[PDB]
Amino acid sequence: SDKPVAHVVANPQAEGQLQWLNRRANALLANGVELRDNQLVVPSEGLYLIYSQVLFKGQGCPSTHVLLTHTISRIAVSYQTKVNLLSAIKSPCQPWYEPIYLGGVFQLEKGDRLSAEINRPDYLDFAESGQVYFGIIAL
Amino acid sequence: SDKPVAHVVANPQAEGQLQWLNRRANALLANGVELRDNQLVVPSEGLYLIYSQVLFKGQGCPSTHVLLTHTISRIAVSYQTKVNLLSAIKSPCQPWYEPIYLGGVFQLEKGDRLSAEINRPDYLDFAESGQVYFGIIAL
Amino acid sequence: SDKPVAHVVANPQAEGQLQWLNRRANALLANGVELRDNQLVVPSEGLYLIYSQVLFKGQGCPSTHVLLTHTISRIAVSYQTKVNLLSAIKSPCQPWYEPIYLGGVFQLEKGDRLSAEINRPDYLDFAESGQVYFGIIAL
Structure with a gap:
């Protein structure tokens, strides 16, 4: 059980923001x-599988064409x-x-940082479990 | 070739149900x-990458607002x-x-069970190959 | 750093085609x-995690019902x-x-080939970074 690993979830108690949290369970x-x-x-240099999912939810369709994005970025x-590194609209x-859903394999350096960011946290459905997550595993 | 592994597909001969099957090919x-x-x-304790995809298909839009869901659950x-563990709507x-598509890394215990379940099997497009699958690999 | 690995991107300079490219960065x-x-x-026999993402973008909705597909295929x-192996519509x-997004674990043989193909390259949004990718890693 020694591989660098993370699987973090959106804080269901946060408000209008994507706040990653490590939980006791799963x-x-x-x-x-x-x-x-x-x-x-990232604690060490090497290959990592990196992934993230977000779920956006809205009650209806507003007057201005809404574009939603999710992105995983590398800060060297x-x-x-x-x-x-990975994105979609x-x-x-x-x-x-x-x-x-975003996922891919990347060579990362020790101390590099990864962010999983969205543009419309007012549409983030983080109250419902299993919908918003971000993780990495050293391969 | 000793890592616990699975990649199962929806039975294309099943009717109105999501029935996972191991095949000879792929x-x-x-x-x-x-x-x-x-x-x-799960045969042994450890880190597992778990994933699943479903594809829903309908001929038109009915009178009542249809919600589709796919979920991966852990039975300890x-x-x-x-x-x-992982879900979307x-x-x-x-x-x-x-x-x-759902995918993530989880610490599992020996004997734990994983289910990949949907709510509308009447909309499941399992006849077309590569569309409905569920898998795990010990990392 | 010895595991067979690939993470290729769509050539942003290609025109109306999905052309995979290895880059210096990421x-x-x-x-x-x-x-x-x-x-x-594939250089060697074994288990591989295989994945790919495409992003289609159009300016409006044409007169004929557009179907988009992405597929990962194995050439033995x-x-x-x-x-x-993996597909969606x-x-x-x-x-x-x-x-x-498509992703799964498969037993592959040395010399096998993998293709990640689409039907409407005229709709492929490959100019925007992180949107179109294809990769494998030996597990």
């Missing part, structure tokens, strides 16, 4: 992985640059539900 | 993983509780197609 | 994995057959955005 933040300033911190320790309106 | 149920009462059985041997109607 | 094609005729080539060296019209 969530992970182990073997060097830390949560700092809402970002996952060496440079402090912030690069898009959805338009729910031409109650609605829009899940977005 | 499907797995090896190294201790069993399929029992339509659920995957120690407790017999059934907890939601979609509303296809404000022929239609709605895929849902 | 992309991989290592430890025996090759890109040949737009397909990933031993047979030259081409089998569907979406109908964007009853500017729109349709992401499709």
Whole structure:
């Protein structure tokens, strides 16, 4: 049980924000992985499977064309640059539900940080369990 | 080739039900993983990548607002509780197609069971290959 | 750092086609994995996590019902057959955005090839980073 690993969930008690949380039940933040300033911190150099899901929910369709996005970004320790690794966009309106799942394998450096960010936290459905999550595992 | 592994598909011959099946071609149920009462059985304690996809298909939009869901749940041997690990909801109607993909890393115990369940098997498009699947791998 | 691995992206300079590319930054094609005729080539027998995402984007809804598909297929060296491993279909019209994510674990043979293919490259949104990707990792 020594591989760097994390599986964090959106805080169901937060309001209008995507706040990642490690839980006692069915969530992970182990073997060097830390949560700092809402970002996952890589403890060692290597290959990592990185993934995240968000679910957006709205009661109806507003007057202005809504675009939803979910993104996983890499903040390199060496440079402090912030690069898009995985992302997608959805338009729910031409109650609605829009899940977005992202996942991929990346070479990361020790101290690099990962953020999983959205644009419309007012539409984030984080109260319902299993819908909003972010994780990594060293391979 | 010793890691617990499974990649099961929806039985294309089943009717109005999500029935997981191990196939000869491009499907797995090896190294201790069993399929029992339509659920995957964990042979050993450890970290597992768990994933599933379903695809819903309908010919049109009915009079009552349809909600579709896909869920992966953990049945702990120690407790017999059934907890939601990964889930999403979609509303296809404000022929239609709605895929849902779920995936994440979890610490599981030997004898724990995993179920991948939906609410509208009458909308499940399991006849078309590669669309409906459920799998795990010990990491 | 010896596991066969790949994480390739759609060439943002290609036109009306899905052309996979290994990049200097945040992309991989290592430890025996090759890109040949737009397909990933397996260097050794074993279990692989395989995944891909595409994002389709259109300016409006045309007169004929558009169906979008994304598929991951296995070309066996031993047979030259081409089998569907993972796929999904979406109908964007009853500017729109349709992401499709596919991922699963498969036993592959050395020399097998994997293709990640779509039907409407005229709708592929490959100019925007992190949206179109294809990868594998030996587990």
